[PDB]
Amino acid sequence: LEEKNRMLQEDPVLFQLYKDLVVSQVISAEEFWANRLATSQDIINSFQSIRQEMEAYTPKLTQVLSSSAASSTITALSPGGALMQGGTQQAINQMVPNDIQSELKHLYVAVGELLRHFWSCFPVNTPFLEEKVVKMKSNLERFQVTKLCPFQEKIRRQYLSTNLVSHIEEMLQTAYNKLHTWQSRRLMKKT
Amino acid sequence: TKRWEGGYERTWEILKEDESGSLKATIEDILFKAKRKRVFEHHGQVRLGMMRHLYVVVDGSRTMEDQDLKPNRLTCTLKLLEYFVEEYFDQNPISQIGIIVTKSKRAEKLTELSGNPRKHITSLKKAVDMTCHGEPSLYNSLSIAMQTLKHMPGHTSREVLIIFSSLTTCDPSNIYDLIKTLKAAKIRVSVIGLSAEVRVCTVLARETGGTYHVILDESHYKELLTHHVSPPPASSSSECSLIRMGFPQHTIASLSDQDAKPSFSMAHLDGNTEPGLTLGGYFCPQCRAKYCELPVECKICGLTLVSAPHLARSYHHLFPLDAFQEIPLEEYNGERFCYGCQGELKDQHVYVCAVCQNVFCVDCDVFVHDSLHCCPGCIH
Amino acid sequence: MKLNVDGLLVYFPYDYIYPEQFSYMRELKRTLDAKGHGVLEMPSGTGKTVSLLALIMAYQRAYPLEVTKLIYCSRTVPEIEKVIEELRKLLNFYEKQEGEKLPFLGLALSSRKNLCIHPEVTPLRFGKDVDGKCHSLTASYVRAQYQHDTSLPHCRFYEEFDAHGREVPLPAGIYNLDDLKALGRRQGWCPYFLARYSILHANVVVYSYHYLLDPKIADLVSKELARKAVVVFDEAHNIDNVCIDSMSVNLTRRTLDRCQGNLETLQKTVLRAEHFLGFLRRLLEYVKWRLRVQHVVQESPPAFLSGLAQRVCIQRKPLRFCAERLRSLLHTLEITDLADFSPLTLLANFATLVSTYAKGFTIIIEPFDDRTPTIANPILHFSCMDASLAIKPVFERFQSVIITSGTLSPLDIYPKILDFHPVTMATFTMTLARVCLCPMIIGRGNDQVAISSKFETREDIAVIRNYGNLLLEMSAVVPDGIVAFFTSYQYMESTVASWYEQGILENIQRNKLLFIETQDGAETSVALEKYQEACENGRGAILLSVARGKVSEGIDFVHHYGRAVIMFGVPYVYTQSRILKARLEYLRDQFQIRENDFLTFDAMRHAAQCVGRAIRGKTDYGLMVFADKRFARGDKRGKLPRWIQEHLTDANLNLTVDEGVQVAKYFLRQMAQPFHR
Numbered sequence A: 001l002e003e004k005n006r007m008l009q010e011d012p013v014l015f016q017l018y019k020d021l022v023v024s025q026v027i028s029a030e031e032f033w034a035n036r037l038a039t040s041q042d043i044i045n046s047f048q049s050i051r052q053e054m055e056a057y058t059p060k061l062t063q064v065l066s067s068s069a070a071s072s073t074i075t076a077l078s079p080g081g082a083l084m085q086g087g088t089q090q091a092i093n094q095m096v097p098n099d100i101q102s103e104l105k106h107l108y109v110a111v112g113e114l115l116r117h118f119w120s121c122f123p124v125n126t127p128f129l130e131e132k133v134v135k136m137k138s139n140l141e142r143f144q145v146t147k148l149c150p151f152q153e154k155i156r157r158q159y160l161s162t163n164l165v166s167h168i169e170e171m172l173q174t175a176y177n178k179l180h181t182w183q184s185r186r187l188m189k190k191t
Numbered sequence B: 001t002k003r004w005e006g007g008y009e010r011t012w013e014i015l016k017e018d019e020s021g022s023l024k025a026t027i028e029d030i031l032f033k034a035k036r037k038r039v040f041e042h043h044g045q046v047r048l049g050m051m052r053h054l055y056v057v058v059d060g061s062r063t064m065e066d067q068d069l070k071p072n073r074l075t076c077t078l079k080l081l082e083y084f085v086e087e088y089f090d091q092n093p094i095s096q097i098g099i100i101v102t103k104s105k106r107a108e109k110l111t112e113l114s115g116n117p118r119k120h121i122t123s124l125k126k127a128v129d130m131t132c133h134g135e136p137s138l139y140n141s142l143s144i145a146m147q148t149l150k151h152m153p154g155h156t157s158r159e160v161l162i163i164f165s166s167l168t169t170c171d172p173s174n175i176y177d178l179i180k181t182l183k184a185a186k187i188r189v190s191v192i193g194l195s196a197e198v199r200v201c202t203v204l205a206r207e208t209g210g211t212y213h214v215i216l217d218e219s220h221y222k223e224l225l226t227h228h229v230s231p232p233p234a235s236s237s238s239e240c241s242l243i244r245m246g247f248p249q250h251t252i253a254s255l256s257d258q259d260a261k262p263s264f265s266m267a268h269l270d271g272n273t274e275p276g277l278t279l280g281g282y283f284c285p286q287c288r289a290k291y292c293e294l295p296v297e298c299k300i301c302g303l304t305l306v307s308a309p310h311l312a313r314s315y316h317h318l319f320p321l322d323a324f325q326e327i328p329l330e331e332y333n334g335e336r337f338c339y340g341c342q343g344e345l346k347d348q349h350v351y352v353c354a355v356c357q358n359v360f361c362v363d364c365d366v367f368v369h370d371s372l373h374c375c376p377g378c379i380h
Numbered sequence C: 001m002k003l004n005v006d007g008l009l010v011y012f013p014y015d016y017i018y019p020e021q022f023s024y025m026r027e028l029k030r031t032l033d034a035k036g037h038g039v040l041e042m043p044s045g046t047g048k049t050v051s052l053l054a055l056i057m058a059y060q061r062a063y064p065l066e067v068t069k070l071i072y073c074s075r076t077v078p079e080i081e082k083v084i085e086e087l088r089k090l091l092n093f094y095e096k097q098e099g100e101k102l103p104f105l106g107l108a109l110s111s112r113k114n115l116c117i118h119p120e121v122t123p124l125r126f127g128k129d130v131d132g133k134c135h136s137l138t139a140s141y142v143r144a145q146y147q148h149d150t151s152l153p154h155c156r157f158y159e160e161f162d163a164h165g166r167e168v169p170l171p172a173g174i175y176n177l178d179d180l181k182a183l184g185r186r187q188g189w190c191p192y193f194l195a196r197y198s199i200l201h202a203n204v205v206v207y208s209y210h211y212l213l214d215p216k217i218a219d220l221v222s223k224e225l226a227r228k229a230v231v232v233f234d235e236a237h238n239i240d241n242v243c244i245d246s247m248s249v250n251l252t253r254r255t256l257d258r259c260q261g262n263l264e265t266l267q268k269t270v271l272r273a274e275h276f277l278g279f280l281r282r283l284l285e286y287v288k289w290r291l292r293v294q295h296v297v298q299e300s301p302p303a304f305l306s307g308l309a310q311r312v313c314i315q316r317k318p319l320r321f322c323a324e325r326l327r328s329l330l331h332t333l334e335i336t337d338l339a340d341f342s343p344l345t346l347l348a349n350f351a352t353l354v355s356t357y358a359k360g361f362t363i364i365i366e367p368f369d370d371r372t373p374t375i376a377n378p379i380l381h382f383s384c385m386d387a388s389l390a391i392k393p394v395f396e397r398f399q400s401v402i403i404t405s406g407t408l409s410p411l412d413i414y415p416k417i418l419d420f421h422p423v424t425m426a427t428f429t430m431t432l433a434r435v436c437l438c439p440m441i442i443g444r445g446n447d448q449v450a451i452s453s454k455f456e457t458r459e460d461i462a463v464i465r466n467y468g469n470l471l472l473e474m475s476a477v478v479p480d481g482i483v484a485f486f487t488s489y490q491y492m493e494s495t496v497a498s499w500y501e502q503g504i505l506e507n508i509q510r511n512k513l514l515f516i517e518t519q520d521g522a523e524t525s526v527a528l529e530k531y532q533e534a535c536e537n538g539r540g541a542i543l544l545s546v547a548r549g550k551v552s553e554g555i556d557f558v559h560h561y562g563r564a565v566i567m568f569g570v571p572y573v574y575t576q577s578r579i580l581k582a583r584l585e586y587l588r589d590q591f592q593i594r595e596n597d598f599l600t601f602d603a604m605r606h607a608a609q610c611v612g613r614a615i616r617g618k619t620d621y622g623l624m625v626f627a628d629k630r631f632a633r634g635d636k637r638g639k640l641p642r643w644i645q646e647h648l649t650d651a652n653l654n655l656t657v658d659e660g661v662q663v664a665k666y667f668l669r670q671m672a673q674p675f676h677r
């Protein structure tokens, strides 16, 4: 107990993570410190058609460009246009206040650690690891429900335009899909 | 007898005249002979390589405070080590570098064995303001290097480089037993001393198969490092050696699309300052982890992220371009336009590829053999 | 290969020949054709022996009548075995390049302890009793009594050699000492006896100086072997010292006590000829009279016999019959063993010497001892004064005696120290692709104060501090071993005590390990072993010793051992004991040798001998420094061997410690690069 307490005190970030994972019932303290220690002849027909069309070729001047086309191209290339999109998270350094940013970084670190444990468990070569991956998935789901859902609610309340949760969802969805695919393979191997 | 005590050389007898003006043909021949001064190979040395896990051991004793190399040994050594790391990572795509510093009869692993160039350079720059105290310990440094490299795969060439400034080393135990263990571990050890020759370093280099050298000046130091840059020759086929590595595409994000997803970089998350939450970067093909630098092994799934052009840049050595057959212009009964540059063929010799039987002038042949490394006709 | 000298072709095992070796062969051929003596000087211990043996063999092949027997006397047994194996390699090369054998015999001679097969005498460590036990086991009386086949333990190697080994010769095959022992044990013969029987029918033979300089054994080992023969004394820079010690004896309380203890037993055996029985009894009291006399010194080489003929009134003639008595009376008494008997023999030898040789000698008595000067210790030593006495029997019996060593820089003092007529005056300096040695003389230190080892400044604090600073900052530039030589043990211990008193010796300790050479043989051996094992790895070490010590010449500092050799002051022998001064006076009034000149010659000879052992082999390299301004004077630089003079530039003759360290750093940095052959 005394030895365990001093480790948390030296790293408050880990202490905050320890509370966010153990007190919130996401993971057990036993598992917490365990890890720490082409087509048909129509193509030839089209080729012949274009050959005949370009057989009688004459240069043109007016048809090459028009005032409307040039204006549209300039508008597209003007600052703030489609190709010149000037927003690109205008003030993301000051958007989504740093109080949320610190929480986002903590969530990123926690998700990275959990996924690192999951991928270290992968590939599953022994039946012992099968339960461990299921426990990791359960811990991931509990952490998501505990933190990301309030995080999403806070983001929606403040109406932040950045899709910060989207990347976290992408990694979690990828991990879930990989686990489901591996389980499907495991079922197929037993057939 | 002597070569210079015989007859005086008359080099001007080469030129001759038969039509009172044929010297133009002779000078044209001289100009033609002036070209093709290369062996049609940019390197001409080792045509292959092997993955190297190189460990650099740096002395941190009081002898590094000596001012033999301005301003002192430590600063010049660190600068040349930064240059060596840059060049080594440039010429070795999938190699790894670890750094160990010996001080006060102990060894500290300054940087983990990895392929990131920026991390090593940052650590070296941080180490400039270290404190030089105590005496070096070769035994501890070699023990740490062996322990780290003991579990490495056999196909990789395990190499250890020691920069030994002090002439004295404190060994807690016998060192020759450690040398025998290293020999059994097939670990190559090379030492570049600074002051003078030391018996133990020479014995270690001889037994481990490495090379021992002594620095004369900064230029000699740089030459020795450059010599150490080159990879060792590799056998034709050793084992089933392969590696699972990904090729992360550099997908940036734009706010024009609805998939503009900011993400903090894994490398930047460990920094004290606010990590760069850029629009996009390099996404891991396996776990979609975001990284800014390459080549960097993935922190999450352990996959190796490498850039395909870096690997492909050395592919021309595997399939070198055959030398074209030199044929005089008169004897070639065909087109008189170069197939590569469309220029008129006026030189006395025309080069014809053995595969596509095209025509290339001297300049185009040199360009193909030196830079292009591929025959334009064979591509078609 | 086949070197074509002006009138001969000589086969050489090594294809490549250095110019120094060729010039040495030229000079040696000139000397052999000159039919006279000479002196040589070479800088390499190795490579001289092969050239010497090759030229000797070529000369014997060309002129069998001119040269018949060869002697290669050396200092110790390792030199004997290495020259024997070198001769074996040369013979193997000749056999493989020629295809036919030659009737040449080569054997090595040593003490009876070295050549013996009885397991009952090998384990003991008594060199004075092995010969006595060998004589007791087999002798003339043993041979006489063997006719009746007495059932008693005795040596039987001779009893088989005299009937089987005196008929079969050994015309071909050079045999080493181990080879001789193996042949003797397989044939049941004594190696010494077969060596004695085989020297007459032999081509070459090697042994130590003691078998020629000592007259008591040279006559027995070399009487009529060859009137026209060639002898060479390799590594004989200290030939004068061993010649002096050959006719030098010492007397103490132990000798007289042993004599008085054993004379009672001798009389008891006798009572179980008469001209000596009563003669020997009263000789002891004349020399014991000086024991009870408390006088400083008595010198009377001619008048000693006069005084002997007064207390007891004995004629001088019967003394000359003492030595010939040893082989006559003693064998009649059937001495069981020579134990408790050697002092009696040495007293007779001393009496014969003083009766015969008294023209250039001196009798010295000293009532002094180390740390216990006056309790009871009158030591009488009949120290010799002229080195010519031990060298006449070899100059008058040989034709081309050659004296060569690594340090014979003054070629004008050796011909006058001992009666000699050189015709060579030849010196050679080795050359390589790079300068393998960087001698330099360090004068004043960083404080601009001389670091001379002057007697009046031995206790000076400044010079000791400068020496310590030099040894400290020098220890950090030259790695894996530095060999330092001091003037004397007293000065060495007084210097290290002062260094320990200050906080300076710890700085040297944290760089290199310090090892101190002492008088104990076992302690010195273990210190040398641990120094070698510490220099094997990167720890590095310092070996502190004295120039006039058994460790100075007992070991050779080959490459990677002692890259730097430091001379802390000019090593001057102590003027006390009233022995050096007698020799100085004799040389002054006889050979017209200046006292200061001879002292400087001896000091520089010892310094060069102890500094030239760091270069053994062409690939070997080393640093040599002299920490004394007195070396800077030309009178001492000129005494250095020629192969070191040319590398001692005038730029570094009085440079301070810092510039000397810089020069050492540059030399070591530039000498580490690869060189080709």
Ligand code: SF4
Pocket: C112, C115, C116, C117, C118, C133, C134, C135, C137, C138, C155, C156, C157, C158, C189, C190, C191, C192, C193
């Ligand atoms: S005769 Fe020879 S073997 Fe016998 S004891 Fe003497 S030395 Fe030894």
Ligand SMILES: [Zn+2]
Pocket: B284, B285, B286, B287, B288, B289, B298, B299, B300, B301, B302, B303
């Ligand atoms: Zn990954």
Ligand SMILES: [Zn+2]
Pocket: B338, B339, B340, B341, B342, B343, B360, B361, B362, B363, B364, B365
């Ligand atoms: Zn062209």
Ligand SMILES: [Zn+2]
Pocket: B353, B354, B355, B356, B357, B358, B375, B376, B377, B378
């Ligand atoms: Zn082609």
